[PDB]
Amino acid sequence: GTTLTVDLSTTYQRIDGFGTSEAFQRAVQMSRLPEEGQRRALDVLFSTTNGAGLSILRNGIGSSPDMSSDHMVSIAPKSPGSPNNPLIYSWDGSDNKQLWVSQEAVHTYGVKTIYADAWSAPGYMKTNGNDANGGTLCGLSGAQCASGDWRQAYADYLTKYVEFYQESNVTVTHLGFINAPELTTSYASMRFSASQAAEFIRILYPTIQKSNLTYKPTIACCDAEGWNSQAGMLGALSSVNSMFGLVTAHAYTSQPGFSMNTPHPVWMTAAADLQGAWTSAWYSYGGAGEGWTWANNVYNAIVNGNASAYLYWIGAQTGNTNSHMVHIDANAGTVEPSKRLWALGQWSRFVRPGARRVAVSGASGSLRTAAFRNEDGSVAVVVINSGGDAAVNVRLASSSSADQQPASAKAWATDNSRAIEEIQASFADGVATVNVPSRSMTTVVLYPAADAL
């Protein structure tokens, strides 16, 4: 058959993981399900045995004065009048039901990475006095406000949000202070130039470092709406590379098809078929909503975009578009995962946080392949097959040390009839032999002996 040979001596980027968000009250929609539906939604998103095993949760740091519409209410919704006055914290113990999703992800399912990102400062900290319709943080260069300089106040505010999570037994590991800073919208939005982002990082970094936080989160920037627009910000950010540790961008205004010039890991923190009519299918024709298409979008972001993480926009939500991976029927209390959920899971279940991408060779024309060395020494080989059933052999390069060689192997596939379903991995003297199904994403995992006799 086709032999795929993994070269552990040729390494690329680290994989931090895969995930999604329940921002803008999508967590509230989950919380309104019956207890059984709540558990099924959480299981399909986070279960490492029977769901997508998503390893990252991205939360919104609420900017709004109330929970009107789908707004995320701020921890400090009321202005103290002046930035000289202590901020007025009005904690609701909920954070728009994201705290509950976070507590389940961490304490029930073992998630260790929690990315909190503000779309806006509270309106009283901004040039336009509103968390929506753009505007800029008061006190930045070119944004001097009558009300005063709110830059330190915003840093104190973000630090306090992380502290409220910490006191609710969730560690925020990564912290963002803008989203789509090039875009004014009718919802939470805030305009920063790349130079303004650098200016604010110089204020936020020492604020975090001097804080009483148990774990100092890594600062991220800037959740631009595409690879091209985020890459355009890196020049101005380069003066503060010592003060942040994560580059973030979405896949809307351009695709993650090149490696950004930055020393930091790069995360693709939001993508979706936002406009597309709901489909649950894995493959119909390669349309924008199909699970097959999304398995390939992840492949492209990692292999071509040099991404260390991949987050779909929303996990579970109501509504009839492909903005989300898991459909909620609010009336019926039902939860239906799309094959986009299983696409991301077919990655996330087997490519665990800290995995190192490694070279794999031997792919025929209908196969696209990638390989990952997990921290535990298990080697996950991704095979995306556009053709018919394909007989594949999976092995390490002969130069591998004998104790890196597998003692066992398993395989799982997702396709039109399978959701991360185990398939036969016949194992002979270090070689896994697998029938990769037609139009599937198959992951073959080679397991060393480790401490087992």
Ligand X SMILES: *[C@@H]1O[C@H](CO)[C@@H](O[C@@H]2O[C@H](CO)[C@@H](O[C@@H]3O[C@H](CO[C@H]4O[C@H](CO[C@H]5O[C@H](CO)[C@@H](O)[C@H](O)[C@@H]5O[C@H]5O[C@H](CO)[C@@H](O)[C@H](O)[C@@H]5O)[C@@H](O)[C@H](O[C@H]5O[C@H](CO)[C@@H](O)[C@H](O)[C@@H]5O)[C@@H]4O)[C@@H](O)[C@H](O[C@H]4O[C@H](CO)[C@@H](O)[C@H](O)[C@@H]4O[C@H]4O[C@H](CO)[C@@H](O)[C@H](O)[C@@H]4O)[C@@H]3O)[C@H](O)[C@H]2NC(C)=O)[C@H](O)[C@H]1NC(C)=O
Ligand Y SMILES: O[C@@H]1[C@@H](O)[C@H](O[C@@H]2CO[C@@H](O[C@@H]3CO[C@@H](O[C@@H]4CO[C@@H](O[C@@H]5CO[C@@H](O)[C@H](O)[C@H]5O)[C@H](O)[C@H]4O)[C@H](O)[C@H]3O)[C@H](O)[C@H]2O)OC[C@H]1O
Ligand Z SMILES: O[C@@H]1[C@@H](O)[C@H](O[C@@H]2CO[C@@H](O[C@@H]3CO[C@@H](O[C@@H]4CO[C@@H](O)[C@H](O)[C@H]4O)[C@H](O)[C@H]3O)[C@H](O)[C@H]2O)OC[C@H]1O
Q: Residue 42 in contact with residue 53, Cβ under 8 Å?
A: no
Helices and strands in the chain: count of H runs, count of E runs: 9, 22
Dist CA 176 CA 308 (whole Å) = 17
253 makes contact, choosing from ligand Y, ligand X, ligand Z, none, with CB < 5 to 8 Å by partner type, with ligand Y
12 binds ligand Y (CB under 6 A): no
* CB 225 to ligand Y: min, Å: 6
Given candidates 12, 164, 252, 278, which one binds ligand Y under the rule CB under 6 A?
252
306 binds ligand X (CB under 6 A): yes
243 makes contact, choosing from ligand Z, ligand X, ligand Y, none, with CB < 5 to 8 Å by partner type, with ligand X
Summarize as ranges the residues that interact with ligand Z (CB under 6 A). Answer: 50, 337, 419-420, 422
Give the nearer residue to ligand Z in terms of CB position, either 48 or 128.
Answer: 48
Q: If you search the block for the tokens 């903005």, which residue do you land on? A: 323
Q: Burial level of 375, CB count in 10 A (0-12/13-18/19+)?
A: exposed
Q: What is the DSSP string of 364-419?
A: -TTEEEEEEE-TTS-EEEEEEE-SS-EEEEEEE-TTS-TTTS-SEEEEEEESSS-S
Dist CA 360 CA 397 (whole Å) = 9
Report the 10 Å Cβ neighbour count for 115: 26
Query: In terms of Cα–Cα distance, which of 374, 333, 290 is closest to 14?
Result: 374
300 binds ligand X (CB under 6 A): no
Give the nearer residue to ligand Y in terms of CB position, either 240 or 249.
Answer: 249
312 binds ligand Y (CB under 6 A): no
Site for ligand X in 208-237 (CB under 6 A): 218
Dist CA 243 CA 250 (whole Å) = 22
* CB 230 to ligand X: min, Å: 13
406 makes contact, choosing from ligand Y, ligand X, ligand Z, none, with CB < 5 to 8 Å by partner type, with none
187 binds ligand Y (CB under 6 A): yes
Dist CA 96 CA 31 (whole Å) = 10
Q: Which residue is nearest to ligand X (CB)?
A: 245
∠ Cα 196 198 202 (to 5°): 115
207 binds ligand X (CB under 6 A): no
Give the nearer residue to ligand X in terms of CB position, either 263 or 388.
Answer: 263
Given candidates 8, 18, 21, 24, which one binds ligand Y under the rule CB under 6 A?
24
Give the nearer residue to ligand Z in terms of CB position, either 64 or 348.
Answer: 348
Stretch that binds ligand X, among 25-33, 227-235, 242-250, 290-298 (CB under 6 A): 242-250
> Is omega for the bond preceding 221 within 30 degrees of 0, making it cis?
no
* CB 361 to ligand Z: min, Å: 28
Task: Give the three-state DSSP class for 199.
Answer: helix
Given candidates 152, 253, 259, 334, which one binds ligand X under the rule CB under 6 A?
259
Dist CA 284 CA 277 (whole Å) = 14
Which positions touch ligand Y (CB under 6 A)?
24, 70, 187, 225, 252-254, 274
Which positions touch ligand X (CB under 6 A)?
13-14, 218, 242-243, 245, 259, 263, 265, 306, 308
